[PDB]
Amino acid sequence: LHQRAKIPWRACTKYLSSAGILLLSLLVFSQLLKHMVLVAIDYWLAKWTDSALVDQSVYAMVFTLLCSLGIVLCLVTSVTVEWTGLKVAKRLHRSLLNRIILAPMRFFETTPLGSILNRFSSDCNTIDQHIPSTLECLSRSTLLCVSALTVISYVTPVFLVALLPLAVVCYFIQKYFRVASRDLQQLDDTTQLPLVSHFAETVEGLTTIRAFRYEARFQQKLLEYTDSNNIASLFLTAANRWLEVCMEYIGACVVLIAAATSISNSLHRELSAGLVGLGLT
Amino acid sequence: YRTRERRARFVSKKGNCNVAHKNIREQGRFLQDVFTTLVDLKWPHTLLIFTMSFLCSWLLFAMVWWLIAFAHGDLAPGEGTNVPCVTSIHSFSSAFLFSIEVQVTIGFGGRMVTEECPLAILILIVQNIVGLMINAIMLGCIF
Amino acid sequence: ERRARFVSKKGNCNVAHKNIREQGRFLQDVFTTLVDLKWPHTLLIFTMSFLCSWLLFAMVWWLIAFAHGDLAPGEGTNVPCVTSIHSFSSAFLFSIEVQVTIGFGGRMVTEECPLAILILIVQNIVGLMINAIMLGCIFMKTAQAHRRAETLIFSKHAVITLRHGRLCFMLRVGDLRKSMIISATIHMQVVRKTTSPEGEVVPLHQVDIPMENGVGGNSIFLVAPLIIYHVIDSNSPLYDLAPSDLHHHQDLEIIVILEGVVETTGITTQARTSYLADEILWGQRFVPIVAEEDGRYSVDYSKFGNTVKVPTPLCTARQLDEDRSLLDAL
Amino acid sequence: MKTAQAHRRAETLIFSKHAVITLRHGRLCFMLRVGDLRKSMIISATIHMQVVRKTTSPEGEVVPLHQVDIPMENGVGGNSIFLVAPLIIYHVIDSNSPLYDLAPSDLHHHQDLEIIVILEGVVETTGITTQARTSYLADEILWGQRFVPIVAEEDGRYSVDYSKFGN
Amino acid sequence: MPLAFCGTENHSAAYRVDQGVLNNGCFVDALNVVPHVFLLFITFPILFIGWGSQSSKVHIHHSTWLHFPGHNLRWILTFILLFVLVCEIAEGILSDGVTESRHLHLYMPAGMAFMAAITSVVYYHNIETSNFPKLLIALLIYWTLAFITKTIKFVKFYDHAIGFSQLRFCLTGLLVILYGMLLLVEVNVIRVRRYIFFKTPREVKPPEDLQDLGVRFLQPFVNLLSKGTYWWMNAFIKTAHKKPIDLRAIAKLPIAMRALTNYQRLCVAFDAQARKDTQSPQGARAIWRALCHAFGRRLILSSTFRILADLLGFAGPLCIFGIVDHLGKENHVFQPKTQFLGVYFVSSQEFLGNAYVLAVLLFLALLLQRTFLQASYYVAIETGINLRGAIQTKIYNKIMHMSTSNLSMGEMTAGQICNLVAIDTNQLMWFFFLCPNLWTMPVQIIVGVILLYYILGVSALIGAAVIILLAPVQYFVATKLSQAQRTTLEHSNERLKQTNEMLRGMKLLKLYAWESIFCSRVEVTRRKEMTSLRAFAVYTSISIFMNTAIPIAAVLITFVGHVSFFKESDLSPSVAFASLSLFHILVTPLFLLSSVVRSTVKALVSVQKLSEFLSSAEIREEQC
Ligand SMILES: Nc1ncnc2c1ncn2[C@@H]1O[C@H](COP(=O)(O)OP(=O)(O)OP(=O)(O)O)[C@@H](O)[C@H]1O
Numbered sequence A: 001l002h003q004r005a006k007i008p009w010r011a012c013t014k015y016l017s018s019a020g021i022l023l024l025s026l027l028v029f030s031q032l033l034k035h036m037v038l039v040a041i042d043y044w045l046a047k048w049t050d051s052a053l054v055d056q057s058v059y060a061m062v063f064t065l066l067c068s069l070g071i072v073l074c075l076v077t078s079v080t081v082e083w084t085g086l087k088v089a090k091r092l093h094r095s096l097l098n099r100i101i102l103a104p105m106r107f108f109e110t111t112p113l114g115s116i117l118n119r120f121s122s123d124c125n126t127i128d129q130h131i132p133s134t135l136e137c138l139s140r141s142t143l144l145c146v147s148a149l150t151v152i153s154y155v156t157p158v159f160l161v162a163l164l165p166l167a168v169v170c171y172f173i174q175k176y177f178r179v180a181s182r183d184l185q186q187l188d189d190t191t192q193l194p195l196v197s198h199f200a201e202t203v204e205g206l207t208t209i210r211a212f213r214y215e216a217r218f219q220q221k222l223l224e225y226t227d228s229n230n231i232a233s234l235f236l237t238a239a240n241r242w243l244e245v246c247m248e249y250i251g252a253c254v255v256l257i258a259a260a261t262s263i264s265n266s267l268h269r270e271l272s273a274g275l276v277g278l279g280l281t
Numbered sequence B: 001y002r003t004r005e006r007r008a009r010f011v012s013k014k015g016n017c018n019v020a021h022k023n024i025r026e027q028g029r030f031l032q033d034v035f036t037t038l039v040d041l042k043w044p045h046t047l048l049i050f051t052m053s054f055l056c057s058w059l060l061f062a063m064v065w066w067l068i069a070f071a072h073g074d075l076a077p078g079e080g081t082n083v084p085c086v087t088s089i090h091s092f093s094s095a096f097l098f099s100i101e102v103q104v105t106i107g108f109g110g111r112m113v114t115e116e117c118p119l120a121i122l123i124l125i126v127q128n129i130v131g132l133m134i135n136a137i138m139l140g141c142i143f
Numbered sequence C: 001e002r003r004a005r006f007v008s009k010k011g012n013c014n015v016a017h018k019n020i021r022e023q024g025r026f027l028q029d030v031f032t033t034l035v036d037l038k039w040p041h042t043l044l045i046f047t048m049s050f051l052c053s054w055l056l057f058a059m060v061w062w063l064i065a066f067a068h069g070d071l072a073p074g075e076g077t078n079v080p081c082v083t084s085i086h087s088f089s090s091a092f093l094f095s096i097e098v099q100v101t102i103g104f105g106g107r108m109v110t111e112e113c114p115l116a117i118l119i120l121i122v123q124n125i126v127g128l129m130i131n132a133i134m135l136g137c138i139f140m141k142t143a144q145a146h147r148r149a150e151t152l153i154f155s156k157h158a159v160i161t162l163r164h165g166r167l168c169f170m171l172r173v174g175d176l177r178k179s180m181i182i183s184a185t186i187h188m189q190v191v192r193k194t195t196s197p198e199g200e201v202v203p204l205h206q207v208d209i210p211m212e213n214g215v216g217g218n219s220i221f222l223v224a225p226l227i228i229y230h231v232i233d234s235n236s237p238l239y240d241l242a243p244s245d246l247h248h249h250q251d252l253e254i255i256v257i258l259e260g261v262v263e264t265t266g267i268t269t270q271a272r273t274s275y276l277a278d279e280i281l282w283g284q285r286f287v288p289i290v291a292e293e294d295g296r297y298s299v300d301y302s303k304f305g306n307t308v309k310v311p312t313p314l315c316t317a318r319q320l321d322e323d324r325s326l327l328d329a330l
Numbered sequence D: 001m002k003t004a005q006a007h008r009r010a011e012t013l014i015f016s017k018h019a020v021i022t023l024r025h026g027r028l029c030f031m032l033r034v035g036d037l038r039k040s041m042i043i044s045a046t047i048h049m050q051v052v053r054k055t056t057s058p059e060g061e062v063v064p065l066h067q068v069d070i071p072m073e074n075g076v077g078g079n080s081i082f083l084v085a086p087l088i089i090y091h092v093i094d095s096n097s098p099l100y101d102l103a104p105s106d107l108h109h110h111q112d113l114e115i116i117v118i119l120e121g122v123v124e125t126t127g128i129t130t131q132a133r134t135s136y137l138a139d140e141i142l143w144g145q146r147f148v149p150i151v152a153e154e155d156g157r158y159s160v161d162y163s164k165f166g167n
Numbered sequence E: 001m002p003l004a005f006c007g008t009e010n011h012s013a014a015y016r017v018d019q020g021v022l023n024n025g026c027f028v029d030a031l032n033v034v035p036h037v038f039l040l041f042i043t044f045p046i047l048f049i050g051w052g053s054q055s056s057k058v059h060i061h062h063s064t065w066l067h068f069p070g071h072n073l074r075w076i077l078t079f080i081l082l083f084v085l086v087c088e089i090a091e092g093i094l095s096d097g098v099t100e101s102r103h104l105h106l107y108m109p110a111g112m113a114f115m116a117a118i119t120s121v122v123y124y125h126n127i128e129t130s131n132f133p134k135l136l137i138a139l140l141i142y143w144t145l146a147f148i149t150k151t152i153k154f155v156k157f158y159d160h161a162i163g164f165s166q167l168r169f170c171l172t173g174l175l176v177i178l179y180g181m182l183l184l185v186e187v188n189v190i191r192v193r194r195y196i197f198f199k200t201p202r203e204v205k206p207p208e209d210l211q212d213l214g215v216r217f218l219q220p221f222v223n224l225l226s227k228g229t230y231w232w233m234n235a236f237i238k239t240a241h242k243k244p245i246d247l248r249a250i251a252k253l254p255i256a257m258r259a260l261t262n263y264q265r266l267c268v269a270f271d272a273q274a275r276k277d278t279q280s281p282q283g284a285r286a287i288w289r290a291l292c293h294a295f296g297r298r299l300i301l302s303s304t305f306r307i308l309a310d311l312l313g314f315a316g317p318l319c320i321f322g323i324v325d326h327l328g329k330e331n332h333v334f335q336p337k338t339q340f341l342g343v344y345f346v347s348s349q350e351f352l353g354n355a356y357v358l359a360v361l362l363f364l365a366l367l368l369q370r371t372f373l374q375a376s377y378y379v380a381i382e383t384g385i386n387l388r389g390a391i392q393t394k395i396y397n398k399i400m401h402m403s404t405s406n407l408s409m410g411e412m413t414a415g416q417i418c419n420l421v422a423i424d425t426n427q428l429m430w431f432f433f434l435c436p437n438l439w440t441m442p443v444q445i446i447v448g449v450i451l452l453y454y455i456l457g458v459s460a461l462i463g464a465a466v467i468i469l470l471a472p473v474q475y476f477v478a479t480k481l482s483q484a485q486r487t488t489l490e491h492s493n494e495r496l497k498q499t500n501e502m503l504r505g506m507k508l509l510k511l512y513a514w515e516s517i518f519c520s521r522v523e524v525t526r527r528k529e530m531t532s533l534r535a536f537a538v539y540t541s542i543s544i545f546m547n548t549a550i551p552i553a554a555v556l557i558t559f560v561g562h563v564s565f566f567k568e569s570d571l572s573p574s575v576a577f578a579s580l581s582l583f584h585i586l587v588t589p590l591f592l593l594s595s596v597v598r599s600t601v602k603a604l605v606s607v608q609k610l611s612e613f614l615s616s617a618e619i620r621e622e623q624c
């Protein structure tokens, strides 16, 4: 139960109490607005190519506006996420500094004194330097999937009949992976901390180890320390490879299903091969 | 929590020895005792093997009867100038039904075995011997 | 030269029966012999029994139609004895149909000839009898359990070592399958060309060996590999096995015979192995094999026959009684 | 059930024509040879020996055929025997044996004595338990004769010369 | 109008068997169905006994295996065979659409083969896990029987002069080779296992590393399909849901990936290097040549998969171009039309003109590309982990043999040698991850550029140049990103080391009421820290913009430029939407090749730094 934690409660604490509402909304507003244009530019290209294949007109200025809207929105979304990520990072650190200073000494004596340090160096680093980057790519990843799935569904409405059976399998792959990926990544980090310390202590006391003629054992410890580090990383790589193969046969099954229905709907409902291309690319 | 997880049992309260073997270097002796294995299987599995062992036998010789009558040339939908190798074989459906009749010994007699096909007489011998041998082996497993 | 084995490592007694004053007892037990045959060999007897039976009555049906005048070319005025018999090939096909009971019916048995009615009676009685014979033999072949003994496993070489002071000829026997051998039993025998004070010479004397069971019996419960040891007391024939004479050309052999009814079929089986003189390692123990899992045990059959070195006296068990007695007296 | 009959398998279990009484390990025993002719085994064979002789209790009981069992002098006490080669089945005449007062003088024909020997055991082929039964009247117990050795090692294996089975 | 196996057309005259049965174009098709129904009915009872028993089989709980000689050559042929059988199905269903009858003999013989081929590898695998080669006779008969019947069909095509111009002649000819090669694989099993006829079988035992109960990363030894799809991980992933993953679950790593095993190979690579070549120093080139010897044979395999996955990646744009172009034609009444008997054999160009054919071939190509590509990552990664494993040992083995001189140990403190394992080794380890990229990303871009020129023309190259022209600026952005990152990295440590003193003497800092004074030092240091982080946040914000706005800019310039400057075509969905996929395919290597170069630049420093440290002062007189 402790390991099973999707952690949607931690996201709310970050955004509501540290980011704001003006900056948070413009982050969400820009993301939906940016990918709405990204669909439109592809969609408008299909209509342009399909109709211009000899009312109607030359699409020599409208396509520029959609691209110009898309290019500018990329700058807006990129700046807003990073600017907001800066605001959360800086003001959260001030809150933590104003708390530990205004805190009783009983907690400091009781605490391992590394719990405060870790939540000050390791945790503040990930919040400051990674969330502003991971959040931007996380939203763009899930919005591109939403953007892609919506266009495929619109081109071929018969696809979403099979999407629900396919999405459920996607959920279970996206379910069991996180349970293992967290555990492997925790096993990835906690196994390399003893390795670097072991190197440091051998350099600290090199004279003593050779004196006892204990270097035979310490090398065997290194092989035990290194092998545990590698086997934790090998499983992490396999887990990523297990996800990536499975989440690409699902994507391949989509391509065949989308292509099959789109071609048939281009022969009977007369899709006119325009939306078929968008259904494939 | 591993301190108070469970205490391994030697045999459960209802037999069912709670011991799991490892590194079994099997050399096929798992399946070499086929007739012991077939009995060990649960009844619903036995029904599937009972069904498959007979459906496959009927259908293996269905392809034989269909092909023999194909090669003989009495499959052609025309006047019966020749004497058919096995009468009334018109389609593979008739070839399948005739395979049921021979092996299960129903013998309706609409699809007879003619004397004018020395190859078909051999298969009628083979199907009966395989049909008798499958039955006796399957009866023994059931008993 | 070579040293013979009384029974090989997989049973298969290497004894040659010679000068058998055979009274035909080999063939009197046809039903027992038929089961002892290999499966490919059984099919030949299975096939040739039916194929001859159809062909024996193929000649009868053809002769009956020949004598009755049925196979005379032309649509004769007479009613055919058996309809549509116009060749021995037709007679062969009709022979198959009656005995197998296919009964297509293009070749009926008419009511005209009474001889064919008798032959139709004879062929059915023969068909039911032969089929009943073949069913029984195949049922006992399907109930064979000699291949179950192939899954009963013994360690490659046994050991003699220390256990609770005394000296015991330890061993290991394992069961690979998951089914049980109900009411297991272990008999160990020492085979040596033993002479007697009276002057007799026994070429291969089999002396039974106690199994050192808790209740002084033979019953064992085989679920995980066990150690079948024999405490070498004053009466044990191995009381004078020194480690020096454990070499190859030593007239010594331990037969181990494991018996018990297979739970699946109910057929009793035997598993037999023999440990020669060179297949006994003094002063070695068997590695711990049964580990514990989260909620079950675990048998590492990779370590089934692995033996480690263990300190022990290199003196005979007879000298262990004398050494203990002198120490106790002192 | 007629096919699984083992009455013809008991015929291939062989007993010598006459048993003998000789000395063994400083004692007096009643020896016998039992042989199996077929290559298959009889699983879990067990052999019982009984003395059938009209024995009267001192209180006045008259038992026309009193069957008193006899120990097999096995190394473990139990009666189980592993029969592949012909085996000398010998009963040691202890202070308890009913044969404790037998001499060559009273071993003639019209002697009220009989030794029954019963060999049980299941067939390793059909799984059917069988029985081989023989009797040895007094005259058929040759006092003071030993059985010849029958097993001689061949080039690589053993060999039982069945031609000298009852010699 | 019932279902007729042969042609029901011409008053059902296709069953006539004059002039030999083998000359009946349908009967030879019938002869090719028996070898498959024979196996489909021989193994189904055999497999179902196992599957029913597998429901209650416990020996397979931790059982071992032994892949038969030719396990890899069996699966690679089977997948090739499965692919070609799909092509025959596609042709068979393609030809019969013109006739009034079904003509089931065109594809059902192949449709039965595809089922038989799948079982032939399920049946083979069940005989591989249970080391019982004797059952391979049924498999051996199938390959002998299928090869003979198919060859008779192939030669009979040549008698009627079918010719290679017909696709069915090509696929039938191909099937003879695949069936023949699969036949030789089964015979080669008998040669090495020696189980049918030879008196003394040369049995093979499972490998010792597999026999361990403490080995649970069974990737190195599984069937070739599970080496690609990582199927064996399924049980471990499910176990993670109930039992949390600790060092108990992650068991001892296999022999091939053990640090001691890798260290032996690295020393042998060094020892052979100093034996074949008599070179006094151990420089950067000495190490670089050492690693290639010890890990090239796996690095090449990773490159081979990546090169093939890169080429198969462009099958998407070609299928998109092919599918839509066929749909850009109003005339669908026209159909493949050429005859030899009346079966209407279809040709090559007509086969790849049908829209449904290309979608299926796209589906098959996607499975290969996305499986080769993933297998390319694992081979590259596993080699990288082993390179780290064999270099940490070599560095640690150098720690034992180094002297403690004040000129030596007074210079390289423990921090200097700690960063060597953490920073210097990881950037070298991460280089072996991305090594396949620099050999192939130029290929994928060049192949992308070569065929993007053909798709749209010149305007695609003009637009794609913007991607290429703005990439060097992106290298400048990434470099300027890291420079601002070290400023924060150095400043965070200074503030974190400053507060470490604050949090260490807190009692004296709280009983003396110094908390207010000391906190202001942290805030002031943070402000000097936060300006640096703001610069880093700027460059990572600009990095995203160039990452995502350039592809839109590439398309915007390409399509408007095509209409305005070129106007050479109408930009049909066949051409326009084929190019959109190419831009998506090319952007990922184009805008990530900067990182591959940067890692290679960093890796050159790491090996240079590692080689400088590895030849420092040693504890002499040890050998004497
Ligand atoms: N894991 C196992 N699975 C099945 N049988 C086993 C296993 N381990 C041992 N045996 C059986 O035990 C006997 C030999 O065991 P032991 O380990 O002492 O010798 P070994 O050198 O492994 O034998 P061999 O070379 O004959 O296989 C043989 O009958 C062998 O089949």
Ligand SMILES: Nc1ncnc2c1ncn2[C@@H]1O[C@H](COP(=O)(O)OP(=O)(O)OP(=O)(O)O)[C@@H](O)[C@H]1O
Pocket (backbone or CB within 6 Å): C019, C020, C021, C022, D014, D015, D016, D017, D018, D037, D162, D163, D164, D165, D166, D167
């Ligand atoms: N070599 C043998 N082969 C088969 N059966 C044998 C053999 N030797 C003995 N028997 C069986 O054992 C019985 C007793 O054998 P024994 O040698 O003691 O007497 P015998 O005088 O040879 O036998 P008989 O004259 O009754 O045949 C024989 O009657 C016979 O049934």
